[PDB]
Design a protein around this ligand. Structure first.
Ligand SMILES: [Mg+2]
Ligand SMILES: [Mg+2]
Ligand SMILES: [Mg+2]
Ligand SMILES: [Mg+2]
Ligand SMILES: [Mg+2]
Ligand SMILES: [Mg+2]
Ligand SMILES: [Mg+2]
Ligand SMILES: [Mg+2]
Ligand SMILES: [Mg+2]
Ligand SMILES: [Mg+2]
Ligand SMILES: [Mg+2]
Ligand SMILES: [Mg+2]
Ligand SMILES: [Mg+2]
Ligand SMILES: [Mg+2]
Ligand SMILES: [Mg+2]
Ligand SMILES: [Mg+2]
Ligand SMILES: [Mg+2]
Ligand SMILES: [Mg+2]
Ligand SMILES: [Mg+2]
Ligand SMILES: [Mg+2]
Ligand SMILES: [Mg+2]
Ligand SMILES: [Mg+2]
Ligand SMILES: [Mg+2]
Ligand SMILES: [Mg+2]
Ligand SMILES: [Mg+2]
Ligand SMILES: [Mg+2]
Ligand SMILES: [Mg+2]
Ligand SMILES: [Mg+2]
Ligand SMILES: [Mg+2]
Ligand SMILES: [Mg+2]
Ligand SMILES: [Mg+2]
Ligand SMILES: [Mg+2]
Ligand SMILES: [Mg+2]
Ligand SMILES: [Mg+2]
Ligand SMILES: [Mg+2]
Ligand SMILES: [Mg+2]
Ligand SMILES: [Mg+2]
Ligand SMILES: [Mg+2]
Ligand SMILES: [Mg+2]
Ligand SMILES: [Mg+2]
Ligand SMILES: [Mg+2]
Ligand SMILES: [Mg+2]
Ligand SMILES: [Mg+2]
Ligand SMILES: [Mg+2]
Ligand SMILES: [Mg+2]
Ligand SMILES: [Mg+2]
Ligand SMILES: [Mg+2]
Ligand SMILES: [Mg+2]
Ligand SMILES: [Mg+2]
Ligand SMILES: [Mg+2]
Ligand SMILES: [Mg+2]
Ligand SMILES: [Mg+2]
Ligand SMILES: [Mg+2]
Ligand SMILES: [Mg+2]
Ligand SMILES: [Mg+2]
Ligand SMILES: [Mg+2]
Ligand SMILES: [Mg+2]
Ligand SMILES: [Mg+2]
Ligand SMILES: [Mg+2]
Ligand SMILES: [Mg+2]
Ligand SMILES: [Mg+2]
Ligand SMILES: [Mg+2]
Ligand SMILES: [Mg+2]
Ligand SMILES: [Mg+2]
Ligand SMILES: [Mg+2]
Ligand SMILES: [Mg+2]
Ligand SMILES: [Mg+2]
Ligand SMILES: [Mg+2]
Ligand SMILES: [Mg+2]
Ligand SMILES: [Mg+2]
Ligand SMILES: [Mg+2]
Ligand SMILES: [Mg+2]
Ligand SMILES: [Mg+2]
Ligand SMILES: [Mg+2]
Ligand SMILES: [Mg+2]
Ligand SMILES: [Mg+2]
Ligand SMILES: [Mg+2]
Ligand SMILES: [Mg+2]
Ligand SMILES: [Mg+2]
Ligand SMILES: [Mg+2]
Ligand SMILES: [Mg+2]
Ligand SMILES: [Mg+2]
Ligand SMILES: [Mg+2]
Ligand SMILES: [Mg+2]
Ligand SMILES: [Mg+2]
Ligand SMILES: [Mg+2]
Ligand SMILES: [Mg+2]
Ligand SMILES: [Mg+2]
Ligand SMILES: [Mg+2]
Ligand SMILES: [Mg+2]
Ligand SMILES: [Mg+2]
Ligand SMILES: [Mg+2]
Ligand SMILES: [Mg+2]
Ligand SMILES: [Mg+2]
Ligand SMILES: [Mg+2]
Ligand SMILES: [Mg+2]
Ligand SMILES: [Mg+2]
Ligand SMILES: [Mg+2]
Ligand SMILES: [Mg+2]
Ligand SMILES: [Mg+2]
Ligand SMILES: [Mg+2]
Ligand SMILES: [Mg+2]
Ligand SMILES: [Mg+2]
Ligand SMILES: [Mg+2]
Ligand SMILES: [Mg+2]
Lengths: 123, 54, 119
RNA sequence: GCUCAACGGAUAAAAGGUACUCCGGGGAUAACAGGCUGAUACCGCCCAAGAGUUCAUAUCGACGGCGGUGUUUGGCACCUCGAUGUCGGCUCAUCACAUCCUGGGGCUGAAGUAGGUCCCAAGGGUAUGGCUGUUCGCCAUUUAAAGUGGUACGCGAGCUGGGUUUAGAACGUCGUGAGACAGUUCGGUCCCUAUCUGCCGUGGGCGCUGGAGAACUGAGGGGGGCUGCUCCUAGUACGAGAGGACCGGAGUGGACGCAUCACUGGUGUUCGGGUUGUCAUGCCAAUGGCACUGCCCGGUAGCUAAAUGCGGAAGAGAUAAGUGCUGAAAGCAUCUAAGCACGAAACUUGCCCCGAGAUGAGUUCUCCCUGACCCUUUAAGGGUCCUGAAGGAACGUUGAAGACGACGACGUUGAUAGGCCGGGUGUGUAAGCGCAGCGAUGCGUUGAGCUAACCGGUACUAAUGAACCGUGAGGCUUAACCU
RNA sequence: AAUUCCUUGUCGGGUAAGUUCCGACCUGCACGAAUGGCGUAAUGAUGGCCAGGCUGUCUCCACCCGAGACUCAGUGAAAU
RNA sequence: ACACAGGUGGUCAGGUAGAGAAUACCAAGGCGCUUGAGAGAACUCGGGUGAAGGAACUAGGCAAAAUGGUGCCGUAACUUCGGGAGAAGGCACGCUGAUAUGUAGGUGAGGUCCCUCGCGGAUGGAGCUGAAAUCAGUCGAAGAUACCAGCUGGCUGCAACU
RNA sequence: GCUCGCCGGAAGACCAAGGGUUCCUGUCCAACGUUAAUCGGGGCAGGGUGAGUCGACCCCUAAGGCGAGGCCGAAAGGCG
RNA sequence: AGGACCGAACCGACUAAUGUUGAAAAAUUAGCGGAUGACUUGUGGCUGGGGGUGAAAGGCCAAUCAAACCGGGAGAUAGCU
């Protein structure tokens, strides 16, 4: 359940560590963002020398959520923090070449095949 | 919030029509004491369904 | 809302309702019959009948729990000595409610709650 | 003898402030609002000089002209000053179409996607943030779209008081001065228990023509009507190419609503446990009371959303713009005058709910009492005895029903409530005893003890024998049938 | 600027976005030197802005505990 | 104006915790505050908790929420050299035993010498009270465990400050 | 009478100011107590306040008032 | 030592909420500032209306103050309702 002003960590290695969500894509009055939902974020805390800098605005995807996902059988998979992976505003493709931490099987799709492969663990 | 015109005795009586009282439909009589008491209650002496409790 | 719930506030908080019920149960055990309002006489059963079933099995832990619930040694002793064997054959139904009528000061319903084995 | 010039001349002689303010008055007279008109504002229409590579009208439109709304700034001051409370914001909406999207269509200087203009269409929807008190407006990022206006520039007996607008103080300016500035800055009491109309919901009385208990027909009314993205058709139609379809299907989701607690969680001061201070139970142990539930840790049922199921329709009828067929007036032509057909989220049905007080008071299956007497006012008459039915009402146990009413279940021929047995769930090895350790403490008895609203059972207790209301074959006229 | 109508004057900093804030430019409608000017260590129930934590302020409310509101018994007003 | 949630000067000051007249629980002592009962709708007030975000609400962090005590290390720009500063930030806190059959310390007897000789002094430790500190162990998610009990920093205008 | 809860640097005990029988007993329930009431600071009757050591009275004065005569002032009167 | 610090009695009233025909003709609860000094308080006295006082708000002067209250002029006047 990600919304505006939500502070997220960064799973990739593009040079960011803390980001702030500003919009959720999908339609009108769209307030909640789960895993696999494209959102738009700004960068608040970034490493000195990285692929991005502070103040940049770009799209991102959610791979981990403290609220968690719900499998059809009822088995809910939660986490201990909210993390996201950066993308591009035009191509919607990841910037970094690594994915820290595990991911969820509710993320795999023709658009995110480059995230599950780089993730060391898939749930 | 206050009235603007004085109501009438007719309207007052119409309102008070539902403020009446309903009497007791019927009373109960003890089998052995022959008194008159309320339904499912005890008499003034201590009788209930013929037995004595006081 | 109130759906499938239980218990009656009786315009009192928990710390007052528990103490009032404890005092009423102690008085009922001491006198074998009392007069009170009908809702109180109905809610006292749920406190006194389990308290009698506890005394139906004599031991140390049961007496300690009854003392914790009542705070009256002279009441718990009687409960474990007399009421125990007296109601050891009854599977519940240790109280009998008889309506008394009403009251003058508040016109509230009144009723006598007593033990079935009293006379 | 007086520019008494305010010149029929109030004194021989006289300036200002009040937001510290006060009285009598005025809607005769001011600002917001309401009213009349529409100079202004907005919109619509007419000729066509032209722009438009030629070509006025794909799309704009001069120099000019004609109209509509009463939406802005405005004119008059007709209602209100023995008070109609005012800008903006929050909640709450409703109506209109000169429509932002969705729907259908015409033209195009429309190859296709994407577009421009115009007609019909209000069924639905119509964004979150930074700045500012701000509507407005600038910017960031979405959206299928982020509409125009009216409702006392909607809504303060619904909320707010940021500004404007009282008394305090200051800055800049003016005034020699008290003071003044829709110039600025700091701070600065928003009362009302609803009498009537209205609305959301729930009931009592009576009537529907004998009464009672049930199931319905549905006149009529209400609720909803929104759509994105991906794939197939198809990288096909189209296009020298980048690019990229109409129609028709499939799937998954966003905002909205209805329903529910099985699952994921919150609450759960009525369950269990940890722990601090203090008091008490003659004392240890063990407990109880208080200190927000003392502070916390989990958590039963129930209620819940963030949780999961479902819906927006398909289809039919009549249609607007529009496209047509045949076809004359007008020997041709022509969608029309006769006739026929297609055609939109607009309309009526279709989906759900209420609903015969629908007084036009409806329909159907059932149940119930088939006894006698007298009196004037001779009748839809009055009274007496006997009778008291079907059924209902009242009291009680009560409910996942409920403000009180009302509704549902039960009442000794009974599981309705309470209690009890077993189980389940939750909390987490109860008290006591023994052992080890100087001791705190741990270990075995022991997944023990306790266990609210849960389940399956159990008359142990409370729901009593009664009594009460409600009657005794049901009006007149006419049509058919049987006597 | 507590002073600037034009003004949200221009640039830079902060924010994804800053009519509010800070540092500069001077074109001071209409600053200015005891109706005092500049700065200033400490202080303010002082005005404004930003940040860390913090949370139902909110997203969007939900449950629970008590007092009222609801019914019954008694007393019993008011504005108009 | 009321048997009114207001105001009114002086004295006495108990115990356990505790720095204390703060706060919690109590003793002597005094009260349940002159309408009650019932069910547990909307809505109002005083509160408690809360799935994810954490000021995005709002004129405005208004209100609400949050740290909050002792000991110790340590603490910037600036400065009128006093301050800022409790700056910021960080660690230990319960209980038992040993050190020490209750330590350091405090109080201080009987019995000893002389003595102007008594309400006297040196010697002496009996008995009583009594921290704080270290080590080891132990129980709970949490040991300043309840009440009480600073949010902090940076920029800036005004007034020096009380 | 048996239990529950509350204040306890008070919601306890003495007083000075102020009030003036409200103190105790018997009795009453017409009006008062925001209900009833056998109760009460409500009605009626009766009783109760004992000082050489407390205070007041008294001695002495401060602020301050009055003020023999006195000074001043149209009367009143003002100051001392 | 401090017109020094935190924080009770005491004094005051900065914010919010309740209330606003209130428990109260300015209060209640949660917070708040001073709290050894330009402090507060008890008793008594003095300063009075064009005057008194005023760390100065046109504030206070007995719930009343841009000139207190009572009586008198007085049946002020009112082209006003
Ligand atoms: Mg009128
Ligand atoms: Mg009535
Ligand atoms: Mg039940
Ligand atoms: Mg009550
Ligand atoms: Mg308690
Ligand atoms: Mg002359
Ligand atoms: Mg003339
Ligand atoms: Mg006037
Ligand atoms: Mg007029
Ligand atoms: Mg006007
Ligand atoms: Mg009008
Ligand atoms: Mg041409
Ligand atoms: Mg006008
Ligand atoms: Mg007016
Ligand atoms: Mg009027
Ligand atoms: Mg007005
Ligand atoms: Mg149209
Ligand atoms: Mg319509
Ligand atoms: Mg339709
Ligand atoms: Mg901000
Ligand atoms: Mg308006
Ligand atoms: Mg308004
Ligand atoms: Mg009105
Ligand atoms: Mg204001
Ligand atoms: Mg003005
Ligand atoms: Mg000006
Ligand atoms: Mg109201
Ligand atoms: Mg009816
Ligand atoms: Mg559930
Ligand atoms: Mg369940
Ligand atoms: Mg749970
Ligand atoms: Mg809990
Ligand atoms: Mg639950
Ligand atoms: Mg205890
Ligand atoms: Mg013990
Ligand atoms: Mg106690
Ligand atoms: Mg033809
Ligand atoms: Mg033809
Ligand atoms: Mg549709
Ligand atoms: Mg179990
Ligand atoms: Mg054990
Ligand atoms: Mg235990
Ligand atoms: Mg054990
Ligand atoms: Mg075991
Ligand atoms: Mg059990
Ligand atoms: Mg300056
Ligand atoms: Mg300006
Ligand atoms: Mg700028
Ligand atoms: Mg500046
Ligand atoms: Mg100058
Ligand atoms: Mg100046
Ligand atoms: Mg000057
Ligand atoms: Mg000079
Ligand atoms: Mg000068
Ligand atoms: Mg100065
Ligand atoms: Mg912040
Ligand atoms: Mg009521
Ligand atoms: Mg009257
Ligand atoms: Mg009273
Ligand atoms: Mg009082
Ligand atoms: Mg003490
Ligand atoms: Mg409640
Ligand atoms: Mg809370
Ligand atoms: Mg908490
Ligand atoms: Mg939360
Ligand atoms: Mg929890
Ligand atoms: Mg959380
Ligand atoms: Mg945070
Ligand atoms: Mg904001
Ligand atoms: Mg906003
Ligand atoms: Mg605050
Ligand atoms: Mg403080
Ligand atoms: Mg400066
Ligand atoms: Mg400034
Ligand atoms: Mg100052
Ligand atoms: Mg200065
Ligand atoms: Mg206590
Ligand atoms: Mg105290
Ligand atoms: Mg008196
Ligand atoms: Mg008397
Ligand atoms: Mg007395
Ligand atoms: Mg007496
Ligand atoms: Mg009487
Ligand atoms: Mg009375
Ligand atoms: Mg009274
Ligand atoms: Mg008396
Ligand atoms: Mg003496
Ligand atoms: Mg003298
Ligand atoms: Mg003389
Ligand atoms: Mg004199
Ligand atoms: Mg000081
Ligand atoms: Mg003051
Ligand atoms: Mg004030
Ligand atoms: Mg206070
Ligand atoms: Mg304070
Ligand atoms: Mg202080
Ligand atoms: Mg005095
Ligand atoms: Mg005067
Ligand atoms: Mg005078
Ligand atoms: Mg002034
Ligand atoms: Mg006054
Ligand atoms: Mg005044
Ligand atoms: Mg005068
Ligand atoms: Mg005269
Ligand atoms: Mg007169």
């Amino acid at each position: 359940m990600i919304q505006e002003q939500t502070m997220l960590n960064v799973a990739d290695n593009s040079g960011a560590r803390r980001v702030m969500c500003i919009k959720v894509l999908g339609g009108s009055h769209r307030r909640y963002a789960g895993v696999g939902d494209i959102i738009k974020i700004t960068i608040k805390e970034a490493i000195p020398r990285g692929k991005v800098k502070k103040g940049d605005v770009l799209k991102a995807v959610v791979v981990r959520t403290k609220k968690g996902v719900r499998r059809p059988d009822g088995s809910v998979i939660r986490f201990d923090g909210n993390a996201c992976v950066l993308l591009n505003n035009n191509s919607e493709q990841p910037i970094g070449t690594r994915i820290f931490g595990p991911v969820t099987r509710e993320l795999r799709s023709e658009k995110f095949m480059k995230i599950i492969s780089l993730a060391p663990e898939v749930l | 919030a206050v009235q603007q015109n004085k109501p009438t005795r007719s309207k007052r009586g119409m309102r008070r029509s539902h403020d009446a009282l309903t009497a007791v439909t019927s009373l109960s009589v003890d089998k052995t004491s022959g008194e008159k008491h309320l339904r499912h209650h005890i008499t003034a002496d201590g009788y209930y369904r013929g037995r004595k409790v006081i | 809302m109130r759906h499938r719930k239980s218990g009656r506030q009786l315009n009192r908080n928990s710390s007052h309702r528990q103490a009032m019920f404890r005092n009423m149960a102690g008085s009922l055990v001491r006198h074998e019959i009392i007069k009170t309002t009908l809702p109180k006489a109905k809610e006292l059963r749920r406190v006194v009948e389990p308290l009698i079933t506890l005394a139906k099995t004599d031991s140390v832990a049961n007496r300690r729990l009854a003392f914790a619930r009542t705070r009256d040694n002279e009441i718990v002793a009687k409960l474990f000595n007399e009421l125990g064997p007296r109601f050891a054959s009854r599977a519940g139904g240790y109280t009998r409610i008889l309506k008394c009528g009403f009251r003058a000061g508040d016109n509230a319903p009144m009723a006598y709650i007593e033990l079935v084995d009293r006379s």
